[PDB]
Write a protein that binds this ligand. Structure first.
Ligand SMILES: N#Cc1c(N)[nH]c2ccc(Oc3ccc(NC(=O)[C@@H](N)CO)cc3)cc12
Ligand SMILES: N#Cc1c(N)[nH]c2ccc(Oc3ccc(NC(=O)[C@@H](N)CO)cc3)cc12
Ligand SMILES: O=P(O)(O)OC[C@H]1O[C@@](CO)(OP(=O)(O)O)[C@@H](O)[C@@H]1O
Ligand SMILES: O=P(O)(O)OC[C@H]1O[C@@](CO)(OP(=O)(O)O)[C@@H](O)[C@@H]1O
Lengths: 435, 435
């Protein structure tokens, strides 16, 4: 029963010494415009790619934009606009043509089809396409009738679109409103107790006040629903930073549970003055279970919670060594690390990928919350930051996270403002270039 | 900014050298009888206590049973039974009297109030009680009209109740049916678009085919909903066992990633013959990422998946040592371990509690699935087994999990049949008595 440990990830596999060599889902958005279909779409895609499921959004609009000169006006969308309708349907099918090949030919696991899909006919077209390609179909319908909520959307993300460039806000608003009503007359909402008894679907009502959920067929559907109950749209601020410089940092040594240096403590102190002058009605503070992050918290005189998930990557046998010592003592290891930094796992330790598993609950609580300061470690920080700035696995292990700097993230429109704030206290540079 | 590492759990805390010294929720069940309110109740309570939230079920029936001679008949439940109604309400309030003191005075975090609570009046009584004690209120309503489903319930769990002892099945069925109809006339289901717009609630429809979810106020509510989308009632079998004996077991050494012994391999082989003769239409196999469990899988010639969550408890600095060597080299540690085995964490390693965090995703997939063989390790196995047999944290680190034995668990009525099956291959006994 012979077996052999892979070199990068360190998984055992069977020696098989002419070497010969879960269906995908289409998440189908449904709803009138200005209902946050693209926002829910981007945000799910960011989640799924980050918990490792490959996912791509296929927004029918962008196809229309690649297809058609420059935005005339809402007249384009009139149901009597015979030729627009032809061109719009054509865009719809090109989107599907590309969905088929993302999922049947490039192994993506989920495609989000971001289109109004407000008519039972169109939804039968998609369902059919799903069947003949052995794709699952999941519908997320966002349904809301509050003019406040729509006006809001139209202001935050529509007027500032590409289609409007040549336009003052005033007119781009009236044009969109009229454009919404082009869908109003034929909109048939999803109905579980009628024409849609057999559809796997979630209906989001009034921006998450309420949900109708039908026929959850697999984990990934179940996890979408869980995600959707945890997100919200209240405005807020996520602050991320590392522990102030620690003894090991000063010796240039990795891992361990060392405590703050002198400069460490000064930064703790600077951070307190920093939070105060942010003037935040409320704020949660999180740390790891390591001394560094906890001492830094103590400086703030605010209450905090430790998360084992936040502990720095485990360097395994290499714990407490310096990078040079690692090159001298284990050359095979260092090389492999350098050519695959995301998947490389230390002997008896961890990999960035391992973090992302570990840190999923942290991501899920951050979505739940409002203002949060997360005091963690360099690799941990890189992960979180990847989630939030939609960075890839390829670039994650190289995102820059200097000591004594604070990262201030503000969810906004379609993503995140990110300001940097250096608190003016010297430290060692624990980076090493994208090698 | 001085700090000190606790001895058991090894958490840093602040030296504070006259030492001076999230509201709770009431989950309110709602529905007609034979709707699985007690089943959902037990099962949630098992989950929550196991992810560490203290939780207790307060079923109004059992109070009625402590209050009233012996079960006459359904006449007890007639709405015109003036005196029963008085006594039943009294039971209801004693249940609440005990809920108040579990949550305000014994720090439980959740009480499940398992009663019909089918009338808006009664639900106002409870809501009121919640307000004046600053308890949250969450309603889980199970709603189903299929006679198959009710008959089923009545057969699996009602006729075999205490109340019926003096009775053949035939009559206990008619008596319960008549008893259901005592509630039918006054039943007002929860309605989010009417009298219950403002209630945090989940409505389970047709045994999970469909769900209505309103006003999820916190993580624990969000997590209940997630749990409820993952459970099911299809019958199936969970098989648990450890890897066959490994080299370290033979040296009597803990941790490491050693491979199977001779006897190890024989047991792998015996396990294959064991699965075959179980004759299971389908079966998932899971292992850890350690060689032992993986080699054992290889023997089965069935496809399997490795879970890092399943890896054995990390003994930290004590990895690869023998228990004697651990006593000789670290006496302070050994003692602490012996007096708090669940919370004790090895230096730079783990605690049983840590496992339970780690293993939560495994529990959640097991609920999703049907037949599953889980090949893991001694401590991992103890945890899983605690979840399934509703064992406490106090007894978990001492549950017996011999080598080369298979544990066959069958969900049933209100819990789990557990058979043992020893596959007749000698090994070393890696236990050590409840000390
Ligand atoms: N209509 C509309 C929306 C809009 N203009 N922007 C949106 C952004 C998101 C969205 O869908 C949501 C999905 C889930 C939630 N989740 C929650 O509210 C949870 N806190 C409820 O459990 C909220 C909104 C809906 C909208
Ligand atoms: N009526 C009724 C029930 C009955 N006789 N026994 C039951 C046991 C549980 C129950 O509530 C459920 C809660 C969640 C589920 N979950 C599911 O079906 C998921 N697979 C759906 O996402 C199923 C049933 C309901 C019942
Ligand atoms: O991802 P790489 O380049 O290995 O850097 C991660 C390193 O960051 C460190 C310092 O270099 O954490 P920290 O935030 O505690 O200062 C080490 O513990 C860890 O190995
Ligand atoms: O919980 P305690 O009593 O420490 O026993 C756990 C021990 O079980 C072991 C063997 O004793 O696992 P395994 O199932 O691989 O045989 C060790 O790895 C581990 O330390």
């Amino acid at each position: 029963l012979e077996l052999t440990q892979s070199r990068v990830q360190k998984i055992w596999v069977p020696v098989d010494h002419l070497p010969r060599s879960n269906s995908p889902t289409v998440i189908v958005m449904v709803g009138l415009p200005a209902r946050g279909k693209t926002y829910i779409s981007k945000k799910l895609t960011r989640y799924l790619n980050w918990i490792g499921v490959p996912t791509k959004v296929f927004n029918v609009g962008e196809y229309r934009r690649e297809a058609v000169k420059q935005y005339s006006s809402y007249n384009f969308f009139r149901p009597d606009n015979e030729e627009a309708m032809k061109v719009r349907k054509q865009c719809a099918l090109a989107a599907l043509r590309d969905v088929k090949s993302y999922l049947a030919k490039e192994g993506g696991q989920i495609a989000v089809f971001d289109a109004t899909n407000t008519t039972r006919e169109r939804r039968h077209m998609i369902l059919h396409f799903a069947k003949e390609n052995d794709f699952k179909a999941f519908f997320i319908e966002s349904v809301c009738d509050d003019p406040t909520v729509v006006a809001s959307n139209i202001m935050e993300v529509k007027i500032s679109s590409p289609d409007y460039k040549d336009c003052n806000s005033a007119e781009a608003m009236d044009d969109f409103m009229k454009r919404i009503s082009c869908y109003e007359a034929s909109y048939q909402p999803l109905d579980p107790d009628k024409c849609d008894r057999d559809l796997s679907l979630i209906k989001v009502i009034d921006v998450g006040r309420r949900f109708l959920v039908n026929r959850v067929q697999d984990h990934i559907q179940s996890r979408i629903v869980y995600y959707l109950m945890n997100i919200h749209v209240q405005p807020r601020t996520i602050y991320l930073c590392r522990h102030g410089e620690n003894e090991h940092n000063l010796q240039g040594r990795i891992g361990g549970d060392s405590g703050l240096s002198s400069r460490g403590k000064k930064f703790a102190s600077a951070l307190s003055k920093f939070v105060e002058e942010q003037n935040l009605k409320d704020l949660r503070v999180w740390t790891s279970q390591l001394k560094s992050t906890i001492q830094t918290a103590e400086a703030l005189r605010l209450p905090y919670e430790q998360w084992k998930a936040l502990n720095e990557i485990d360097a395994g046998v290499c714990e407490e060594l310096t990078y040079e010592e690692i090159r001298d003592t284990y050359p095979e290891e260092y090389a492999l690390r350098e050519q695959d930094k995301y998947y490389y796992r230390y002997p008896t330790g961890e990999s960035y990928q391992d973090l992302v598993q570990r840190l999923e609950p942290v991501i899920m609580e951050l979505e739940r919350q409002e203002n949060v300061l997360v005091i963690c470690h360099q690799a941990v920080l890189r992960c979180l930051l990847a989630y939030f700035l939609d960075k890839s696995a390829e670039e994650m292990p190289y995102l820059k996270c200097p000591l004594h700097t604070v990262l201030k993230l503000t969810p906004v429109a379609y993503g995140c403002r990110v300001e940097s704030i250096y608190l003016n206290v010297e430290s060692v540079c624990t980076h090493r270039e994208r090698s």
